[PDB]
Design an enzyme around this catalytic site. Structure first.
Site, PDB file in Angstrom:
ATOM      1  N   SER A   1     -14.448  -0.342  -6.847  1.00  0.00           N
ATOM      2  CA  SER A   1     -13.347   0.091  -7.722  1.00  0.00           C
ATOM      3  C   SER A   1     -13.921   0.494  -9.077  1.00  0.00           C
ATOM      4  CB  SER A   1     -12.153  -0.871  -7.710  1.00  0.00           C
ATOM      5  OG  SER A   1     -12.428  -2.069  -8.403  1.00  0.00           O
TER       6      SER A   1
ATOM      7  N   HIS B   1      -8.353  -0.414  -0.255  1.00  0.00           N
ATOM      8  CA  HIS B   1      -8.953  -0.490  -1.579  1.00  0.00           C
ATOM      9  C   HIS B   1     -10.135  -1.446  -1.504  1.00  0.00           C
ATOM     10  CE1 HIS B   1      -8.919  -1.757  -5.967  1.00  0.00           C
ATOM     11  NE2 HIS B   1      -9.145  -0.454  -5.972  1.00  0.00           N
TER      12      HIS B   1
ATOM     13  N   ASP C   1      -6.973   6.048  -1.106  1.00  0.00           N
ATOM     14  CA  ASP C   1      -7.269   4.840  -1.864  1.00  0.00           C
ATOM     15  C   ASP C   1      -6.019   4.342  -2.580  1.00  0.00           C
ATOM     16  OD1 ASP C   1      -8.217   3.525  -4.584  1.00  0.00           O
ATOM     17  OD2 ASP C   1      -9.891   3.376  -3.191  1.00  0.00           O
TER      18      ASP C   1
HETATM   19  C1  LIG Z   1     -11.087   3.998 -13.052  1.00  0.00           C
HETATM   20  N1  LIG Z   1     -10.063   3.672 -12.069  1.00  0.00           N
HETATM   21  C2  LIG Z   1      -9.844   2.297 -11.503  1.00  0.00           C
HETATM   22  O1  LIG Z   1     -10.467   1.331 -11.815  1.00  0.00           O
HETATM   23  C3  LIG Z   1      -8.745   2.369 -10.540  1.00  0.00           C
HETATM   24  C4  LIG Z   1      -8.059   3.706 -10.769  1.00  0.00           C
HETATM   25  C5  LIG Z   1      -9.134   4.592 -11.464  1.00  0.00           C
HETATM   26  C6  LIG Z   1      -8.521   5.505 -12.496  1.00  0.00           C
HETATM   27  C7  LIG Z   1      -8.501   6.874 -12.292  1.00  0.00           C
HETATM   28  C8  LIG Z   1      -7.923   7.685 -13.268  1.00  0.00           C
HETATM   29  C9  LIG Z   1      -7.398   7.099 -14.409  1.00  0.00           C
HETATM   30  N2  LIG Z   1      -7.434   5.788 -14.579  1.00  0.00           N
HETATM   31  C10 LIG Z   1      -7.968   4.993 -13.666  1.00  0.00           C
END
Ligand SMILES: CN1C(=O)CC[C@H]1c1cccnc1
Ligand SMILES: *[C@@H]1O[C@H](CO)[C@@H](O)[C@H](O)[C@H]1NC(C)=O
Length: 346
Positions: free
Chosen positions: A146, A291, A246
């Site tokens: 993640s 996830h 995801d």
């Molecule tokens: C860095 N990210 C996570 O840790 C989960 C979702 C993803 C994200 C993508 C776009 C904007 N903010 C967060």
């Protein structure tokens, strides 16, 4: 199966609240492989939302309450049955306590309520491990799930540069990014996800890989948090694990029977993710709604085209010694709906 906590000797490298960062380690004396895993868990991007995270997600902002040990699971397990890939490796779990997608380089100060030191935590963990056996390594695999998977993309080349500059050119640094490959796509319903990254970078003094920074230039560093944009700039080998649907991607997309508009949205998302991986030679992308995977105990169960993730990673190791007979490294599902792969997790 336990990894033992070590708080950083350089206590200037801190979690958000100024408590020392650290790592959990299980050494394997007979092995020259080192697995450094970056935990995930979103981020926070201003005073008010970091304060809320400090109230109810404090282990992601502080080491004050960390346990002295952690059990290694999945790719961090030392049991061959649970971890067919790297069960004999030296295992490191780096807790995520910087709330900055592992990008920050800012200390707590009279002007900063919180420290955002994720990028510095990684480099300090590596430095301190060199005195514990990492100096003899042949492969350092920087892995993460993640936000930790995005952290791999942001930091793998800096680890490689650090070890080169410290005089260790024989350590092969590689990356394994799990569930950290996101799209800056249109939402299903209208929250401003790319804006939160942009604000975060300024709040954290966030740093991105140099070649990616030079492409996008000042103010546009947020682009480098998106795998399909930062990956082409990286020099270290990176294996990308990414569910096609995801759950965190769906969250940022405001997706929660399914009618035509949402069916088309979901199918288009999987197709777009598939497209971004077409030229990623080491990848594992099952058509599942899920996830994370790599530190889950049942990570051995999912397969794409009949090949499991531990096998794909083993084939990747072989490829880094022309394609290998029966040992594929690029495994992306083509079916267009979550759970069209029968091996998806439940
Ligand atoms: C860095 N990210 C996570 O840790 C989960 C979702 C993803 C994200 C993508 C776009 C904007 N903010 C967060
Ligand atoms: C301790 O960490 C700080 C912050 O990253 C760094 O500037 C400093 O050089 C480190 N000190 C030592 C002795 O490694």
């Amino acid at each position: 199966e336990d990894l033992r906590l070590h708080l950083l000797l350089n206590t200037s490298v801190t979690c958000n609240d100024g408590s020392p960062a650290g790592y959990y380690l299980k050494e394997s004396r007979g092995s020259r492989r080192w697995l450094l895993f970056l935990e995930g868990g979103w981020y926070c991007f201003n005073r008010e939302n970091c304060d809320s995270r400090y109230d109810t997600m404090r282990r992601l902002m502080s080491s004050r309450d960390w346990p002295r040990t952690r059990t290694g699971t999945g790719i961090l397990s030392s049991q061959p049955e649970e971890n067919p890939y790297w069960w004999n490796a030296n295992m490191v779990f780096i807790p995520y306590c910087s709330s900055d997608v592992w990008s920050g380089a800012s200390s707590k100060s009279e002007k900063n309520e919180y420290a955002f030191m994720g990028a510095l935590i990684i480099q300090e963990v590596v430095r301190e491990l060199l005195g514990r056996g990492l100096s003899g390594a042949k492969v350092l695999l920087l892995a993460g799930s993640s936000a930790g998977g995005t952290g791999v993309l942001l930091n793998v080349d800096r680890v490689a540069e650090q070890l080169e500059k410290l005089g260790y050119p024989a350590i092969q640094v590689r990356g394994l990014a799990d569930s950290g490959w996101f799209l800056d796509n249109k939402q299903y319903r209208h929250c401003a996800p790319t804006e939160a990254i942009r604000r975060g970078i300024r709040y954290w003094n966030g740093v991105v890989p140099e070649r990616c920074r030079r492409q996008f230039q000042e103010g546009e560093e947020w682009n480098c948090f998106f795998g399909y944009k930062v990956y082409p700039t990286l020099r270290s080998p990176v294996f990308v694990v990414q569910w096609l649907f995801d759950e965190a991607q769906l969250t940022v997309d405001n997706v929660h029977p399914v009618q035509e508009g949402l069916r088309l949205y979901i199918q288009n998302l999987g197709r777009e993710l598939r497209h971004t991986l077409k030229d990623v030679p080491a990848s594992f992308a099952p058509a599942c709604l899920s996830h994370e995977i790599i530190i889950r105990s049942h990570w051995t169960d999912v397969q794409v085209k009949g090949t499991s993730l531990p096998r794909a990673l083993h084939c990747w190791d072989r490829s880094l010694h022309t394609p290998l007979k029966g040992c594929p490294v690029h495994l992306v599902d083509s079916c267009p709906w979550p759970h069209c792969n029968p091996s998806c997790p439940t």
